[PDB]
A paper describes a structure:
The most prominent regulator of p53 is the Ub ligase (E3) MDM2, which binds to the transactivation domain of p53 through its N-terminal p53-binding domain, thereby inhibiting p53’s transcriptional activity. Furthermore, MDM2 catalyzes ubiquitination of p53, where monoubiquitination promotes nuclear export of p53 and polyubiquitination leads to proteasomal degradation. ATM phosphorylates MDM2 on six residues (S386, S395, S407, T419, S425, and S429) that are close to the C-terminal RING domain and far from the domains associated with p53 binding. Here, we show that S429 phosphorylation selectively enhances MDM2 homodimer E3 activity, but has no effect on MDM2-MDMX heterodimer E3 activity.
The asymmetric unit contains two molecules of MDM2R that form a dimer, where each MDM2R binds a UbcH5B–Ub molecule in a similar manner (root mean square (r.m.s.) deviation of 0.16 Å for Cα atoms between the two monomeric portions of MDM2R-UbcH5B–Ub complex). In the MDM2 homodimer, the last three residues of MDM2 (Y489, F490, and P491) from the second MDM2R protomer are buried within the MDM2R-Ub interface and pack against the Gly35 surface of Ub in trans, whereas in the MDM2-MDMX heterodimer, this is fulfilled by the last three residues of MDMX (F488, I489, and A490). These residues are not involved in crystal packing contacts and are cradled by the N-terminal region and C-terminal tail of the second MDM2R protomer such that residues 432–436 adopt 310-helices in each MDM2R protomer. The helices stabilize each other via hydrophobic interactions involving A434 and I435. L430 and P431 adopt an extended configuration and are stabilized by hydrophobic interactions involving I435, P437, P445, and F490 from the second MDM2R protomer. In the homodimer, N433 forms hydrogen bonds with the backbone carbonyl atom of F490 and the C-terminal carboxylate of P491 in the second MDM2R protomer, and these residues in turn form hydrogen bonds with the K11 and T9 sidechains of Ub, respectively, to stabilize the closed Ub conformation. The MDM2 homodimer utilizes the RING domain and the C-terminal tail to arrange UbcH5B–Ub into the closed catalytically active conformation via a mechanism similar to the MDM2-MDMX heterodimer and other dimeric RING E3s44,47,48.
Residue numbers in the entry:
A (entry chain F), B (entry chain C): 0 to 76
C (entry chain A), D (entry chain D): 430 to 491
E (entry chain B), F (entry chain E): 2 to 147
Amino acid sequence: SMQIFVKTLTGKTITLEVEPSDTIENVKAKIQDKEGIPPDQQRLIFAGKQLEDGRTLSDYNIQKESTLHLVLRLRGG
Amino acid sequence: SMQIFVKTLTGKTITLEVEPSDTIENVKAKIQDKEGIPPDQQRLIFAGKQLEDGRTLSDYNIQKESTLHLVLRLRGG
Amino acid sequence: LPLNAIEPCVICQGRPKNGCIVHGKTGHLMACFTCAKKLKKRNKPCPVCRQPIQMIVLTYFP
Amino acid sequence: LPLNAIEPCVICQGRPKNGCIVHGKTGHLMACFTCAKKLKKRNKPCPVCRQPIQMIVLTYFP
Amino acid sequence: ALKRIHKELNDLARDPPAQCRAGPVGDDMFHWQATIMGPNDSPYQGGVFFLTIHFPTDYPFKPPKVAFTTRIYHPNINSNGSIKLDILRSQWSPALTISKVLLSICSLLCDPNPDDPLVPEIARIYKTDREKYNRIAREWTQKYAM
Amino acid sequence: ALKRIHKELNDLARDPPAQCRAGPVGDDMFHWQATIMGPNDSPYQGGVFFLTIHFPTDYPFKPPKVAFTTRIYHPNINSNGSIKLDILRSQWSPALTISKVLLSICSLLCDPNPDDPLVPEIARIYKTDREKYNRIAREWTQKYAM
Ligand SMILES: [Cl-]
Ligand SMILES: [Cl-]
Ligand SMILES: [Cl-]
Ligand SMILES: [Cl-]
Ligand SMILES: [Zn+2]
Ligand SMILES: [Zn+2]
Ligand SMILES: [Zn+2]
Ligand SMILES: [Zn+2]
């Protein structure tokens, strides 16, 4: 278990308690509990790329004290 | 024109701009604007006594920088 | 700016003020969700203005 | 305790966060009443969660 | 109830009203004593009235039990110091603190309800011979509250 | 709009993001220039992409106008620098700041939508042979974004 940070949409930083084996979907569920944002509206970004729901924090080399960046669900067109 | 203070129900203190000619009813209207409490639910107290709506701050010898105490409307019985 | 907004629930003193008591188009936010829901469930009025509680809104601060 | 609750409206940066955007049983409080009412009048979604705005509650902090 | 009661106690110990004081009796956080100074320019002026307070388990959802221990002459306060006052019963609010309750009771002293009284004999004097009422209340203040 | 724009600029100066930077051109608070660093592990890596930003008078109720000035190879960004992205159109939110818009655009670079493309020819290459698409994107990054 470890702490990570999420910079939410307004720039406010929150702290989450996670495990390296937690999926991005689990992280979005934790953000929903803290912030009231539906997971389908959450787009998490790390190292400039969006994080896919089915992958784990470990898959993305997200470590203790890392910061994920939350933006809104988006679609190119 | 002068300032007075009101200690609201939770203990929070607010500041009002008033004149000695202002009625207690006018003061409760100013409290309603800041606090969203209808005047009929406001009971203002100074020197241990309730302040009646038809009288003025001057009638009660209330001077600049005085603190009024706000409680809820009550009735003995 | 509401400096007292960051103080704990006035009822239980142990949780943040995230239970907005809604009546008409206004709300009084001084209690946590748990405490405010108890008041609504028990048919009690708003603690500060005594108007009927139409709903409790779980309030987040983005 | 929501430390950012005492910061200004994130939209206009000039008024307190007293316009609660209500959707279902939850609310997002990050804008003033004036800005939030503009969004509701124009039928815009909630800025942070995109849920439809059911009402704006003028929020007081007793 | 304990976090709420401790908060009230800390607020009283650092910032009470000029009119009212209160604190626990011994180590019992649920049993307090209080004092109310009689308002100036009243039959109670110069008197100091003692009260007992008992917080229920589900305080502040349920109201505190508040009674005078000092005898006091008033239409809404009986011979055992019980106070018939709506905020102690059906009009209670969990946002009322002991400080606000005591100030409320203090404001009742000079704003009695003689029309629906707790002590009809006192109320009838109040309504028909106010100076006699005031004179007795002053006598009781001297006898019991000084 | 000015109070909001100043606040965003002050925030960018105080807590500067790593991937994206932006600030006014000259003394015109409504006209900014921005840069995005190409994501690591992508054909854009090492590239720096410049963008122009115009804030409308009723920002942030209306979205900023954002266009690339550095040429970039992508299905949803064309050679005139136009970006076709829902958050700059109907899916705008006044809670998005420039920093969040720039990070969003950065995340679009490796998450294109070839199904509803701005440049059909590039989308076709993307879907026909991703390795060829990545080669060309890398070549354009080295030619134009260094
Ligand atoms: Cl409810
Ligand atoms: Cl509304
Ligand atoms: Cl407790
Ligand atoms: Cl402005
Ligand atoms: Zn509570
Ligand atoms: Zn209320
Ligand atoms: Zn605003
Ligand atoms: Zn929302």
